[PDB]
Each structure stands twice: as C-alpha cells, then as structure tokens.
Amino acid sequence: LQFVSPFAFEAMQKVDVVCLASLSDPELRLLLPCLVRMALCAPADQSQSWAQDKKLILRLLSGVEAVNSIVALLSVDFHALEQDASKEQQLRHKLQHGLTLEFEHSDSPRRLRLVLSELLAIMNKVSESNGEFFFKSSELFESPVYLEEAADVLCILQAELPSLLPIVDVAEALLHVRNGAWFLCLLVANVPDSFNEVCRGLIKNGERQDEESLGGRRRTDALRFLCKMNPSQALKVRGMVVEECHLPGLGVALTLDHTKNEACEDGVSDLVCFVSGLLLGTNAKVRTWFGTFIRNGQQRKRETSSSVLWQMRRQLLLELMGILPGLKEEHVVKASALLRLYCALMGIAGLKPTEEEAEQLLQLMTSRPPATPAGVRFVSLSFCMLLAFSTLVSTPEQEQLMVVWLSWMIKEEAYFESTSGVSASFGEMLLLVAMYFHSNQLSAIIDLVCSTLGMKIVIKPSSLSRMKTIFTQEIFTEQVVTAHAVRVPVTSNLSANITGFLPIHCIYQLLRSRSFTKHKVSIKDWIYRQLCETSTPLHPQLLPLIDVYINSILTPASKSNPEATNQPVTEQEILNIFQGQRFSITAQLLVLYYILSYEEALLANTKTLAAMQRKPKSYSSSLMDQIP
Amino acid sequence: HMRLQAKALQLIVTARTTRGLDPLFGMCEKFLQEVDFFQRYFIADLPHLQDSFVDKLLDLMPRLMTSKPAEVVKILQTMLRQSAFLHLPLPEQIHKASATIIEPAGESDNPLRFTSGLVVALDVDATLEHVQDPQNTVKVQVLYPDGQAQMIHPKPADFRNPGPGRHRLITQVYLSHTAWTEACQVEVRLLLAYNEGTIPFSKPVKVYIMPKPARR
Amino acid sequence: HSAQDAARILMCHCLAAIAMQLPVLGDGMLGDLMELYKVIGRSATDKQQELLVSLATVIFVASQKALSVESKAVIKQQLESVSNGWTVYRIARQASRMGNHDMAKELYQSLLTQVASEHFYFWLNSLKEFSHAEQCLTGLQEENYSSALSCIAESLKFYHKGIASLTAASTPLNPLSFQCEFVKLRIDLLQAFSQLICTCNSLKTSPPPAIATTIAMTLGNDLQRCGRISNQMKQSMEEFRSLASRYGDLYQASFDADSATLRNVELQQQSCLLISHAIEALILDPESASFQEYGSTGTAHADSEYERRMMSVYNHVLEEVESLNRKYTPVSYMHTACLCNAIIALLKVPLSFQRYFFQKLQSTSIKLALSPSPRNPAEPIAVQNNQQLALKVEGVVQHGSKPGLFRKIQSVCLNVSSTLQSKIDNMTNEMEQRVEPHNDYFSTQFLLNFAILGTHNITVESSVKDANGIVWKTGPRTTIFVKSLEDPYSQQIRLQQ
Amino acid sequence: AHVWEDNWDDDNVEDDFSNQLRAELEKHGYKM
Secondary structure, eight states: OOOOHHHHHHHHHOOOOOHHHHSOHHHHHHHHHHHHHHHOOOOSSHHHHHHHHHHHHHHHHHTHHHHHHHHHHHSSOOOHHHHHHHHHOOOOOOOOOOOHHHHSSSHHHHHHHHHHHHHHHHHHHHHHHOOOOOOOHHHHHTTTTTTHHHHHHHHHHHHOTTTTSSSHHHHHHHHHHHTHHHHHHHHHHHTTTTHHHHHHHHHHHSSSSSSSHHHHHHHHHHHHHHHHHHHGGGGHHHHHHHHTTTTTTHHHHHHHHHHHHOOOOOSOHHHHHHHHHHSSSSSSHHHHHHHHHHHHHOOOOOOOOOOHHHHHHHHHHHEEEEEEOOOOOOTTHHHHHEEEHOOOOOIIIIIOOHHHHHHHHHHHHHHOOOOOOOHHHHHHHHHHHHHTTSOOOHHHHHHHHHHHHHHHHHSSSHHHHHHHHHHHHHHHHHHHHHHHHHTTHHHHHHHHHHHTTTTTOOOOOHHHHHHHHIIIIIHHHHHHHHHOOOOOOOOOOOSSOSSOOOHHHHHHHHHHHTTHHTTTTOOHHHHHHHHHHOOOSOOHHHHHHHHHHHHHSSSOSSSSSOOOOOOOOHHHHHHHOOOOOOSSSHHHHHHHHHHHHHHHHHHHHHHHHHHHHHOOOOHHHHHHHHHO | OOHHHHHHHHHHHHHOOOOHHHHHHHHHHHHHHHHHHHHHHHHHTTTTSSOOOHHHHHTHHHHHHHSSSHHHHHHHHHHHHHHOOOOOOOOOOOOOOOOEEEEEEOOOOSSSEEETTTOEEEEEEEESSSOOOOOHOOOOOOOTTTEEEEEEEETTTTTEOOOOSSEEEEEEEEEEOOOSSSOEEEEEEEEEOOOOOEEOOOOOEEEEEEOOOOOO | OOSSTTHHHHHHHHHHHHHHHHHHHHHHHHHHHHHHHHHHHHHOSSSSSHHHHHHHHHHHHHHSSOHHHHHHHHHHHHHSSSSOHHHHHHHHHHHHTTTTTHHHHHHHHHHHHHHHHHHHHHHHHHHHHHHHHHHHHHOOOOOOOOHHHHHHHHHHHHHHHHHHHHHOOSSSSOOOOHHHHHHHHHHHHHHOOOOOHHHHHHGGSSSHHHHHHOOOOOOOOOTTOOOHHHHHHHHHHHHHHHHHHHHHHHHHHHHOOOOHHHHHHHHHHHHHHOOOOOOHHHHHHHEEEOOOOOSOOOSOOOOOOOHHHHHHHHHHHHHHHHOOOOOOOTOOHHHHHHHHHHHHHHHHHHHOOOOOTSOOOEEEEEEEEOOOOOOSSOOOOOOOSSSEEEEEEEEEEEOOOOOTTOOOOEEEEEEEEEEESSSOOOOOEEEHHHHHHOOEEEEEEEOOOOEEEOOEEEEEEEEHHHHHHOOOOSSOOOOOEEEEOOOHHHHHHHHHH | OOOOSSOOOOOOTTTTHHHHHHHHHHHHOOOO
C-alpha cells in the first residue's frame, strides 16, 4: 500500500496549484475526489485568482476516468439517499454474491447505499460496544483490488453527508476497520483542516495505560501514520498526548520519530528533555501515569525489540556511548542530565537496568571530570547516585572500582574545592554522611540523598548497611574524617538563616568526641576563620561550640595522656580582630564571649590545671585594656 | 443628585459590558424614569442647582426620549465626564449615630452550652447614640456560622431613654440550632434599616455557642 | 559624545526611558550609539559590565526593528573581547524583553554551551528555543498565507522543544508555573491561529456546494448560506473564548507581577477576545451583532511601544470589521481575507517576554492549614451525620521580601464546598467568608451539614482580595476526605420505618 | 526616586534563582 506523501498533503493544505501540478500521478489518483469536487462544484469564492486556480485544477485533472465515476456518484440523488439512511438508522435503533461483487456489479446508487449501510452498521456496533474493541470484517474493505475506488466513495460520502456522518465517528469506525488506517489517511488527505479534530477524537477515545491491546496498537499505528504524513504537527500531537494522559508509548513513538528526523549532537536530545520533563515535572498525574507505563514495560518479561520501551532504552544507551570517552570538558553537563534521567528511571519509575547498563553506569560514575564547578556538581550527583542505588555495584570488580574511585576522591577533595573556587559542597556532604554513618543516622542519609537529587525516592536501609560496611572500615576512619573535617572550608556568611545540617554541627560533634586532640589536629585556625567570617543573626550552635572548645583547651582528653591539648587563640589575632572597620559586629561579640569564658574557666578549674602543670598563657593586661 | 449620578455610572458600566439591545433599552427606560421621579419629587431647588448634571440633563431630556440608547449612553458618558461638582451646604451641629454593644463582652472562652434544638436566651445590651426612631430602625442581626442571617426585632419597651437623644437597648436574642461537634462563634451585630435596605453601624461581637446532643 | 564614562550609564537609563516612551528617538540616530559602543572597550576599565549592559539595552530599544547583522556582529565582537557570562546573559535578557530574538538566540546558544548545572541548562535551552521560534515568526511576509502557516508550523515545533525543556527545568523548588503556563497559552494561541487560517483556506473546499447538495441553497435549512466551514467557525469561536478564559485565569492566579507584565497578559487576552469578536460579528449573525466601537480608542497613554503597536492593530481590525460588517452575505467572500489580515498583523507584532516571566518579586503565599480531626493518612474522617461538622481553618501569610512592592493584601475570601466522593455533586454547601487578617495569622470556623452515606471531598480556596479590590485567585486549594457513618439505633429505627 | 523604574538591571532587586545563576556564571566569567 502507498500512503499519502507529506509533500502532497502540504500541497493540498496550502492549495498551491503549481505544487499540485508538480506532484506526480499516483498521489493525484489518491487525491482525486476533493480536487474534482473543487473543479466541478459551485465555488464559494468567486475571485479571479481562484478562477485561474480552478482552470489549473482542470489542467491537472486531465487524464482520469475516475473523474467521470465521481461525476456519476455526484449525479446520484443525495436527498433520497439521506432520507433512506435516516429511516434505516431508525429501523436499526428499533445478497447471494459477496459484498465486493455487489459493489462491482451494482450501479453507483447501490454502491453508495451498501457502503453507507456498512459504515452505519459499524458505527452502531461501536456505539453498542461502548469502548470495547472488536474486529469487523468486510470483504469490500479487505479486498486490495478495490481499495482505491472504495476510499474515493468513502470520501464522497464524507464530503456529502456532514451531519449524517460525523468525521470523528467515521474515524473511530475506520479505526475498527482493518485497512481503515490507510482509509483514514486518505480521508484526512482529502479534508486537511479536520486533522486536529481527528487526532483529538482518537486520543479522547483511546485507552489510558494499554499499548498491548489490539485496539490500542491499531490506534497507535494509525496516529503514527498520521504523524508520518504530517511531520510538522507531530509535536503538536505529542502535546495533546501529554495533555490528555493517554498512550504514553505513542508519545514515546513521536519523540523517537522526531529525534530520528532531527540530528543535533551539540545539545541534549529531545528524548532526554521530554522524558525528564515528564518524570520530574510538577504534574503529579502525568508523573504517576508515566510511572505506571514504565512499571508495565518493566513487568513485561517478553523481550520484544519492537517495543518502544526497549527502543528508547537503546537510544539512551547509544547516547551514553556517544558521551563516554578521561572525560571531556563540554560533555559534563550532558552526562549529569543523563544521570538525573537515569535516576528518574530506576528510582521513581522502577526500571530495572540490565548488566551492561549497570556496567556503563559504574563507568560513568568512575569517570574523572575536570576540576570545574560543573565537575563538582557531577561528582556530587554521582556519589549520591551510587549511595542511592548500591544495587548497581554487585561484583567485586566494580566493588574495588568504586573503592579506588572514592579513594581518588578523598585524595582530591580539597584540591577540587581549591581549583573550583566554590566551597566543597561535595566535601561537606561527604563529611555529613561520614558522621551520619558513624552515628547511624540513616534517615538523615536518606533525606540528604533525596535533597541532593532534587526528587523523592525510597532507599533500602540494608543496602545502606552494606555501604556502611564498605564505608566505615577502609575508606573513612576517625583520623581520616578528622583530617577531612579540618580541610573542609568554613561555611561562608554563617547565620541562622542558612538552615540544614552544617559543618559547624559536624565540628561541634567532633569536638564533643575530642577526636581532634586525640589525632593531633590543629583546630584553632578553623574556629578563628569561621568566627571571623560569621555575621548576624546567630546560628545557635556557636555558643556550645565555643564552650566545648574552651573546655577542650583546659581539660585534657585522657588521664593517661594529659598532653592532649588544643592551642588557644593568639593575642595578636585578638588585636587584629579588635582593630576598630574591617570586621563584623557579631565576630568580636563572640570573641569577647570566648576570652571572658576563657578567663573565668581558668580561674574556676585551676585544680585540674594545677594537676597538669601546663598553665597556659594567661592573657596580657595590654590585651585586656585594649578590649572595649 | 449623587444617587442619580451613581445610577448613571452603573448604567454606563452595564452598557459597556452588555450586548443585548433590549436590556440596554430597559435599563435606559428605568434610568430616565428615575430621573423623571427625581424632578417630579424635587420641582424645587432647580435654581439652586447651577450648571448641574441633573438640570442640564433635564434641559436635554426630550432628545433622550427621541434618540437610541447607544447615543444616549455616549452623551451621558461625556456629559457626566464634564458635568460638575455641587456644593454641599454644611448644617448646624449634627451627629452621626453610634451603636456600641457593651454586653455580651465576647472575650469569654467559656462557651455557652445547651442541648440540641433547644434555645438559649442571650441578653443584648447596647448603647445607641443620636438615633431618631430607634424602636423602628435599630434591629438585631445574628449570623449563625452555617451562614444564615436571622433578623430579630426588639419590642418597643426595650428602648429605654435615660436622657436626650441617647438610648439603651436591652433585649433577648433567642439562639438555637442543631448540635455541633465543637464550640463555634455566632456573630451579633446591630443593623439599621430604613424606608428598603440595611446598614451596619456597630462593631460585631462573637459569642461562643455549643449545643450538646440529647442525654438519652 | 562628550562624557567621561561615569554618567553614561545614568543617562543611558534615562534616554532608554525616553525612547521607551517615544519610539522615533532610536532609529533617528542609530549610528552614534553604536560609535559609543565601539569605543567602550578602550574607554572603560571599572564598570565596563554595567555600561555595556545599559548601552546594549538602548541599542535594542533603538533597533526595535530587525537588527542589522553587521551591528550584532560588532556587538558579539566586543562581548567576546571582554564580558562576564552574567553580563552577556543580562544583554540577552534585555534582548528578550525588547524583542530582538535573533541576537537572543545567539546569546542563549553561547550560554547553553557553557552553563554548569542541570535546571540552569534546561532553562537556558528553553529560552533559546523560544528565541529561535520568535525569530522564525518575525521571518514573515505580508499577504502570503501558505508561507505564514509554514512559519507558524516551524515556530510551533520550536516552542514544543522549548516547552519540553522548560518542563525539564521545572523543580519542586522555584517552580516555573507562570512561565510554563504562559508559554503553553501562547502555544495554544498559535495553534488556534493555524487552525483558523487552515479553515480560512478550506473555506473554498466546496462547503457551499455541500450545503446546496444537502438542502436548497435558497432558504437554507441549516443556515443562510450554510457551511461545515461555518460549523468549524463556531468551533473556533468557542475555542478562542475558552482560551481567553484561560488567560484571565492565568492572570488572576499570577497576581504577583508588576504593572507591565500584568498589562502584557491583558493585551494577550485582548488579542484573543478580538479574534473571538471578529469571527463572531462577521462570520456569524451581523444583524444580531450590530456592534460599533463608539468609544474612545487610540490614546497614547500606553506604557509600551509594544502595547501601542498591538493597540493600533486593534484599531485597524475594528475599523475594517466595522466597514465590512454588512457588505456581504454569510458566504464570507472577503471575510476570510479580513481575518487573514488580522492574523498577519497580530503575528507581525512579535512578542514581549517580560519581568515575571523573568525575575520574580513580592512572592506572597498563604499556608492555609485546616485543622479538623487530624487525618495523618488519607483515611476519611468519621462524622455521626446527625449533628454537624466544624472545620477550624487557619491561614498564615508569608512574604519573600518587602510585602508591599506592588499589591498589599487586605482581605482573604475563603471558599469552601463539598462534593460526593462516592458517585447535585453535593454542591449545596457553597460557603465563602471574608476574613480580614488583622495580623499575619487568621482562623475561621466553618460548619458543614450533610446526611449522606458516602464519602465526601471538602475543598477550600484562599481568594486573596487586595486593597483596591480584585479577585486574585491564588492559594493552595487543599482538599480533605470526610467519612459519614450513622447510629445503629438510627439505622434500626429507619429499618423499622 | 531612581532614574528608570522598570529597571531589570539592578543587583539587590534580583531574586534567589538567578542569584544562584549569578554565582555560577560569575564563577564562569567568559563566553566563546
């Protein structure tokens, strides 16, 4: 069978007579009835340009005897045919030869009556079927010899009986008809302006979440034929699909057809953009409906390569093949977008990935990005991706792979921050998840992972227990996380407005643990820089932090090891703060709090200091009377 | 005069929004009828109104009888755009009425409790200041929180007159409804009716009401 | 000419205002501002970004018409010489504001090729696609319907790509609700235009012949000069009116924009209603129409040259339809030509991307926490159905900044109704109450009465009404499930009844 | 009052979203 070409359809829609002259014989044979209706019938427009258009329509109408066939068909009396149709409709509400043979031998009025009876019977059968898909067989409509003239007669019926034959009901009846996809393509080719109405009626009568039904498959194929014959409005059809929340496999088919039409390797593909917008968009019903679609495609255990799900999965895999090289510079944002889409796939839509998909996922995890803020974002999402789905790594090969990768990361934590310029959000979330693992704050682990991902999924606590066994033994020890914490830069412009879980909370908990003085790590530089950079209002952790700090300066960590002692802030630094303007107001308020608590704690707890015999530098009277 | 001007502006706006030529005709007929009622009632003071909207419109009145409503509202629009501003002669030491409910206080969180369908009598004690015809004008309005307004008239023995032009309203208001799940707030306000419509001139008070179901 | 590169930013802002009022001031002296632009690079060292942004804004205002390729190449030369990405992004945003979509497309392409993050990338990409589609729309020829619909199809393909990438950029935080909804309504407007011009072209597809074949041409039974085309005109009129209703909905749900953006949305709804009235008063019954624009129109009190241009187009369409109201029979000989002319003018005026589509201010919100019996899950709340039900709704208003930037909240009209969850849809209780928040917290008690066995859904609305008094339908519109069971003694008595 | 009221170009007026974009894109600081 030959479908109507898009060039022919745009020529018909734009009514360009030179274009219609440029089209060749078979498409004009397909498009005869409307053109001869144009050339014979009384014109609504009487303009002279339309007169030249009409004589050129005659010029191209040279050479066809089906013109005379349509002449006879128009000569049949439509009022009598209509009233007989109405009476037969009322009766239905209340031939030895085959149908093709009767169509052939019987004259044009009997032909019209028989095709009208078949269409009306199919319409009534659908209307009593009430959306239940059936199959209706007619040898006239299934005889490949007589398809052309049969479709011409159907076009004449549609053009002659608007009220008796609603075009949307005709479209549904022909959807039930076996060759009615080709028939409807010819119908919309003859009547171009009803294309949107036809597509709307099809998707309104379509099913919600079944692409495996026969009727759903036929509707999908018909709309695919329509979008193939009109590629310009294919994305519009996709738009109404998204609006009406029907036929998601059909929407995927449109997306794949358009990404086959357009080859733009510079940007992110419209497939990735469209699926990401559906899965991560604000429309809850669309997200749930598409998730149900992915669930059905996943639970479909049959490996059918013509499935649109396997099609778009393969297209995504090939796009990842194009992305994956050392990682290139400009590919990083595209890779991160693909990662977010994949997380949308297995997290909220529950697509189980196969072993090669998982291997490529681990390769993309362990890919080394350049030292950019984009690379920082990429590695943050990658670490959260693996933490979210530790199920991706199964074999010891990928186990030692991600161990080596994470070892490389913890060697390049502050290096990445220093090269980027932005504070290490990745390093600080590493610090947070480190003490979350140590104190078994798995709920906080889950919440931080979801917040980093920007989308809510549920994650397995036993999988996080396995990752805890990986994480807390050889990757992160007490001294390792201590060094990591002291090399984390401070939270810039710290206040109570910036909410969350903070490195200041981490440092406070560590100093409660006294691990800094246990592993001999200087903390006064970190405290000094954070408090010098702090502004107003006040984050409520600062005062207990400073009190624990001053208690750690005086009281040693261990009885057996009295030497465990943090060095206090130097009076030269206190002068540099109190020069005043260079600093804030909250900074020297906290510094005054620290020094006064220092003096009071020295003159209160002097018994332990006497037992220690390491009396620290009591501050000078010059410092005391330079402080206002 | 100002009320006529208001009706004219409302007619102009409905003319802007309305497509029906016969609704326009009806509104025009009623508006001109009200203008005729105004001039018939106030034959006088037409010399007192100089360069006035109403008197210039009375001069142009027969052409409005002749003409279609479209040009009627067009001329009325321009006419009232550059019509006038009238002087308002200030009278002697007049006062505006003021109603203040001193009882119930309404700050009580202790609800008033009864059984379903039965009525509770709530005293209303208010001071009215500078009201003429108080027993016929001052009426009580109670809003039940299911949204309905009950209008209670006081009997004319409830209007004590201790002094000149200052009255006290002491009355009963009968509140009943079906049972409620929790206590709610019933609105009590003093409406002033004329002769045709009502005007609130008191601060509303909220009273906590809670009906219980039957005990057995 | 005579300035020392400090006051130039200030007078550039000022002359931008003056040319924003009167358009001729830019195309009068296009050249000298480009000369100052070319001397910028070796003229400035300290606020290069600021004066670059200002003078690029005014070069767009000056070249409100189609921008010269040489001029934009010089602009790109200086920007690629010395600029911040944030700088050139602000030039791009001003280009989107004025309407120079080709330059906008180029700048969005460069910023897209850099970016760093994901929603940022998708946001820039969507902006790029709308700029490209608007470039295609500006590439239009007068009185050529086939080329016009081809350009429409191309631009609609590019909005489809852009709106997909915009939904990709959408996040639970900073959700682009206004942006997505406004661009979707623009898409639907252009789809309606394409469908209307398609039916206009198919007017000559023997519809009068179908009418004359079905019924007598003289004294037509379906209509006087009846037509399936007239039926499609009725469909288009109803669709356009629905689109105008959606625009009114978008505006009244936005409520947060400034005067320029709210005015611009009003103009888009104006265009939609113009097409609706044109197709209603010309194709449909003109005697029943009988409408003449006997009112003041064409005053230059507008706040934008864009607004003036749409207003002039409106005056042109009104005068043409008022001339052609009674000339022809309903066969629509040149009525289709008049409609096509209106469409071509309305698409020749390009667009104006606006501030609330961009940076948003005065972000006000209503929390609107109801406090019934607390339904932590979606379990419905049992009521005895004999007494009543109380609601105890509560709302607290929050402001992202200085609350009174444009509109100060005055009163909150809460609106509560019921619905029968188990299938007149329980539309009996249609309450609304106008609570005035004295402070930023308020509560109000509602009583619901129902004696129905099935589950019900209860819906509330905020209806924030401002100082001068507007509807402004914003707010959460949350819903609560309520169960309804009855006394066993009551059921036994009813069974005995 | 300021010189021009419809000024999209001002620092403290602009909101959180393209403040974050400003942070990123000032960090970037170039176009090809």
